[PDB]
Amino acid sequence: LESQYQVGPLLGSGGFGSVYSGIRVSDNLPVAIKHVEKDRISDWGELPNGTRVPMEVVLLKKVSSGFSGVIRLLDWFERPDSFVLILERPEPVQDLFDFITERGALQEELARSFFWQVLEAVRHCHNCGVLHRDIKDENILIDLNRGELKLIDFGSGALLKDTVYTDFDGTRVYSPPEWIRYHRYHGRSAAVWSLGILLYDMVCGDIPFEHDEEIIGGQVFFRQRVSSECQHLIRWCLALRPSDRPTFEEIQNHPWMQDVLLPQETAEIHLH
């Protein structure tokens, strides 16, 4: 376990655990090494082995088959008081929160490419039976050479279901008004709300709401110049009534979403 990887410096820590940069010695592959304390684990799941693992491990295995816009789980290990997760590490990389901090409001062409890739990654999770429950710019990595976005941190996720959720541990300022008001939500429509928050974040340079009262107020003020078509998509994603929000298909068929850049064009035009 400590002989398969060379351990580098802390990339960060927080509600997810402590995450370290690392190198797989078998082939010098860059990895990220995440430690989670068993005592902090809320939801437990099981896999085919019937082995009892954190839910986060269950969800990562379900989305890690094949290529996608999700950071893949390469291995994991159980220790006395913790689990250790070996995850992909793009290099060079910046998370979308720091990217928006340094660059400000993104050009619509660039927000379109990013938002499209986030939609494809979330659709992939949903195809695999996985609800992420914490979509935000902090949980998105940008591979700056390939121009590809990658979703991280499934620590608040769940199996996707069609009945109501009554628990939530994701980020409150991205959570929907029906959660704020009634402590209930359905998975896809709550995901769509957080994608509205994220899109506003990208084209305006910060999220629209900080306080419960703004979240349930249903008023979107645009602080940057944003095209009418983009404003319409955002306001649709942020409809107060869940049933009034677009499906993923309606988002991707929206007129603002047409003629997206390829990932490599995005890197060359905006990131190199």
């Binding site: 927080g14 509600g15 997810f16 914490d134 902090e138 620590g155 541990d169 980020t171 340079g205 910060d206």
Partner: peptide, 9 residues
């Protein structure tokens, strides 16, 4: 205007 990270988990 103050932009900040927000915790979860």
């Amino acid at each position: 205007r103050k932009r900040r990270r927000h915790p979860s988990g």
